[PDB]
RNA sequence: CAACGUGUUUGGAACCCUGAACAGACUGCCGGUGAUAAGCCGGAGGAAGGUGAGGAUGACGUCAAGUCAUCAUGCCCCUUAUGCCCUGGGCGACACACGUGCUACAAUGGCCGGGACAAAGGGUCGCGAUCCCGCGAGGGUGAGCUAACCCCAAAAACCCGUCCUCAGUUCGGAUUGCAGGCUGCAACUCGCCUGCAUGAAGCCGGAAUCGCUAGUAAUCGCCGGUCAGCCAUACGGCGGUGAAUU
């Protein structure tokens, strides 16, 4: 009944943070929908490289927004306290929706 | 051709809308030709 | 859809067209319209350096003012 | 840029938030012409006396240096400064992909 | 290049050009490449000056002459002398050797 | 010319610093917050240790945002020099850093860590050659001094480039010395570099230190 | 045939042939295939004289050959009168949708 | 550079012929392959309408009369330019054959490209028109200078 | 056209650049269907495209023998026809694998490296460069 | 993927896709050539074969190349001014010259109608679906979407019919006039776009000159950035059709 979203710029942090959230959620309660990787919001920027006039040879860097949807079925009180027990991940943005 | 802004190919090149390149083909159209027979 | 008028020019209308007729009186803000209650007044349009006296006929109605005053002093042997 | 122009954008922004909602919520009522069409010309006179509070006049410079041009708006920084805040591990996620 | 010759293009950088300057350009360059019979397309003569009383560094007058000729390539010569006139005469000599290099290499 | 190593190796073996994950307008505002924190810490320690004797050498300022709480780690090599001995150094840091973040009054933990070996960390060693070179000491004595000073403290390979206007000159030079392998191209290799600008009296100098570890 | 004042088109397809007239309206050419319901694809040959009457009336209904030349040159003697920047650039034959004239203005430089 | 990797050449779409597929690639202008396809098969349905033989027979018999055996390669020795003829290969003569045939087929006016390619194609089949005359004027120039090698 | 299957018994996949194609290969007659149209009306007349569809079955001479109604999207029509073709090849591999030797000897089980090269900055079309004089 | 008739209603994870790990391609095997070696030529297997393709990557150094108008700064100089605020102009002038692009010069064409298939992006001060008014640009109403949901968004070249089927033309669209709309205190100098009007030059280009070795060239569209709106025919990308020659 709950959907939590994990967005980051870093794959070992969603991998390990979603790893331990799935670990705690499985070892504290019942069957829970797995982490579905929904695709990478990735976007590119072209930076004019030299300060003055060199229009060719620029620097286009790309930022990658990884994200995983992960769904827990049944709200149990010690399971809500299990998830809210873990203020663990270092930056990974977590969201809640129905 | 493509600069011919009174056409459909010209408005498609210009990224604009008028008679010849319509939004919602039900709505908005120039006069209709009647070759008939 | 609405004619644009600089408000000090509107106060020039409300000062001369209410009391009494007058003369060369200066304006800035070139972008104003004609406003046919201005006909017969002479408007001083800024041209980059000075203000020009331009008499306003009723034929000049329906435009903006700096079409009447050129800004480039191109005499020209280019 | 120069030291003056950053504070030009600063004091112009103070005039934005000074009566932003007041004057442009007034314009929310002017353009509503269901009641009348011909009148309110003078009321453009009341539209007039905000001058530097026109949001058309408000730029967005690079906050770290101040180049008015090539400001990638999603970062707030300029062109050339954005390299050395990618190349110094400072921007998160800037993985310099060359796909 | 008064008539019939290659198309002249001047560049004046840090230098207000006069009658005697570009007159000396077309007469020395043009009248020393007047015995040419060359249909060279374009001559770019870029005549900049620098230093001395103008700024830091010695008094310099530096000319580059570039010829975009049909006849086997493009050529350019940059010389830097104490005067404009010594610059343009010296580049005039260099481009005499480069054009005799081109004409003389068309042989047999 | 050449790409710089900390930019080039960002996918692997080098991690970012400002480690907080956000949305575009909030990305620009979070970058505001990051830059003012690094400003307050840098200007803070520069003032309160400029009155003090030696150089500090703050290498990294990592800023992390788990919850509405901001972990700030400061990686200097000589951390005993900072504090006013009960903890009052980091307390007053926490005061002046709280001065410019209290939009949402969220707590922040300023910590401080030790560099493992401070000569092997190119920002600190670049600060040392910056300090001695800002004093009237030649390029050679100070630069070789940095090299043997480094190799006593366990570094695999090193490259030092010092830019123009060395002791008395009006023509700029570049002077670089290398020892061991410094493969700038090998992506696995983990080279850490620094690029410090020394603001001297007769000009500006540029020091650029690559360290292959 | 011959149409209103003096002007007329060839012996070609009817819509195109009305296009050959001096100054008709092409959307109202298309309307003149719709109000009259004239067969456009058929040529100017094979046209009943009632269709020619309807054409001459509907072409009297809008301004045409000499009339628009008259009114546009009335806006040209207007464009001698009142000293405008359009008028000043027609004393000197420039372009008044305003191209950058530092290069290449040869609809009027000739 | 050394060489080109060998070749891959497929046959005709509907007749299974390696020549006619070469011709449909040569009539192609900027990717419109269905239209060049259309022009060629309208030319074949035109050639069934003109005479009553195999279009492979009138096509191959046409391009035999366009293909040269020798051509001018204006070569140089010591700075001296000889107009010496060198014997051209076979498939090279195919490509030149439908080259002159096709470009000369883009000159004869009057009607659509089916009639144009048909008319210059039968002119190649009868020794008239312009493609086989182009064969002659590129053939009577290498014949004119056999005093070189 | 109706008459569904709703299963994945003997499937085949294929993909040219942006054009994917999944096929199911039923032992039938030959009135075969791209997504819900005939092959002629979807492959838009008879270019080479329809012939690339007819190529792997005519390799084994199994034109009457099967009926391959196709589900496909992505890409444009030629590459969608090619992905149909290699879908037929990988489908025929997954019925009667002893057809490996005729199919692989021709270029039917392979895949071209058809991919649009990206624009390279300072160029115009990944090879096209602006001229200079 | 499937059903119900135009949902979150049912199943399935079987295809596709998303996205983490793994594997794979390394002259590994075979034959033949080569001082036995490096390799070289071929063959099998394999999705892919000899850097698989593209990118990022750019040594010591050169041009005392460019940048003191990104930023920092030696020295020098101005300081009731070489500083600062505000309104109007200007960077948009125009006898010419040089360069890069777009449109073309037509029947492989142009128009109309009806059909067909993409990718990648962007968007809560927004994107804006639906309905109505208007020939239209547009106006109102604003459901849905913080984005694999919704919207921008119609893809276009392409296919099937109608016409012109050789003309300065139903090619081409320049320039100008009248009438509008939008953005924004404000659109004259100097914004875009709609409706009508005109229909310039231009029948494939001298001398010379440039790009490209394959999903490339050519060709057809779509998106983004900056951005109130735009001068964008540019730039950064993304697909579609798709060659010839070495």
UniProtKB/Swiss-Prot annotation, chain A:
It comes from the Eukaryota. This is 30S ribosomal protein S10 beta, chloroplastic. It comes from Spinacia oleracea (Spinach). The chain holds residues 98 to 195 of 195 of the full protein.
From Swiss-Prot, chain E:
One of its GO terms (biological process) is negative regulation of translational elongation. The keyword Chloroplast applies. Keywords: Chloroplast, Plastid, RNA-binding, rRNA-binding, Transit peptide, Translation regulation. GO terms for molecular function: ribosomal small subunit binding; rRNA binding. GO terms for cellular component: chloroplast stroma; cytosolic small ribosomal subunit. It is found in: Plastid, Chloroplast stroma. Its main location: plastid. Ribosome-binding factor involved in light- and temperature-dependent control of protein synthesis. Interacts with 16S sRNA nucleotides at the A-site and P-site, where it protects the decoding center and inhibits translation by preventing tRNA binding. Stabilizes 70S ribosomes against dissociation. May be recycled by the combined action of ribosome-recycling factor (RRF) and EF-G. Belongs to the HPF/YfiA ribosome-associated protein family. Long plastid HPF subfamily. Binds to the mRNA channel of the chloroplast small ribosomal subunit and interacts with 16S sRNA nucleotides at the A-site and P-site. This is Ribosome-binding factor PSRP1, chloroplastic.
Swiss-Prot record, chain F:
Keywords: Chloroplast, Plastid, Ribonucleoprotein, Ribosomal protein, RNA-binding, rRNA-binding. Coiled coil: none annotated. Residues 45-116 form the KH type-2 domain. It is found in: Plastid, Chloroplast. One of its GO terms (biological process) is translation. Transmembrane segments: none annotated. GO terms for molecular function: rRNA binding; structural constituent of ribosome. The keyword Ribosomal protein applies. Gene3D superfamilies: 3.30.300.20, Ribosomal protein S3, C-terminal domain. GO terms for cellular component: chloroplast; cytosolic small ribosomal subunit. InterPro entries: KH_dom-like_a/b, KH_dom_type_2, KH_sf_prok-type, Ribosomal_S3_C_sf, Ribosomal_uS3_bac-typ, Ribosomal_uS3_C, Ribosomal_uS3_CS. Pfam families: Ribosomal_S3_C. The keyword RNA-binding applies. PROSITE patterns: KH_TYPE_2, RIBOSOMAL_S3. Belongs to the universal ribosomal protein uS3 family. NCBIfam families: rpsC_bact. Component of the chloroplast small ribosomal subunit (SSU). Mature 70S chloroplast ribosomes of higher plants consist of a small (30S) and a large (50S) subunit. The 30S small subunit contains 1 molecule of ribosomal RNA (16S rRNA) and 24 different proteins. The 50S large subunit contains 3 rRNA molecules (23S, 5S and 4.5S rRNA) and 33 different proteins. Component of the chloroplast ribosome (chloro-ribosome), a dedicated translation machinery responsible for the synthesis of chloroplast genome-encoded proteins, including proteins of the transcription and translation machinery and components of the photosynthetic apparatus. This is Small ribosomal subunit protein uS3c. It comes from Spinacia oleracea (Spinach).
UniProtKB/Swiss-Prot annotation, chain H:
It comes from Spinacia oleracea. Its main location: plastid. NCBIfam families: rpsG_bact. Signal peptide: none annotated. Component of the chloroplast ribosome (chloro-ribosome), a dedicated translation machinery responsible for the synthesis of chloroplast genome-encoded proteins, including proteins of the transcription and translation machinery and components of the photosynthetic apparatus. This is Small ribosomal subunit protein uS7cz/uS7cy. Component of the chloroplast small ribosomal subunit (SSU). Mature 70S chloroplast ribosomes of higher plants consist of a small (30S) and a large (50S) subunit. The 30S small subunit contains 1 molecule of ribosomal RNA (16S rRNA) and 24 different proteins. The 50S large subunit contains 3 rRNA molecules (23S, 5S and 4.5S rRNA) and 33 different proteins. Keywords: Chloroplast, Plastid, Ribonucleoprotein, Ribosomal protein, RNA-binding, rRNA-binding. Belongs to the universal ribosomal protein uS7 family. One of its GO terms (biological process) is translation. The keyword Protein biosynthesis does not apply.
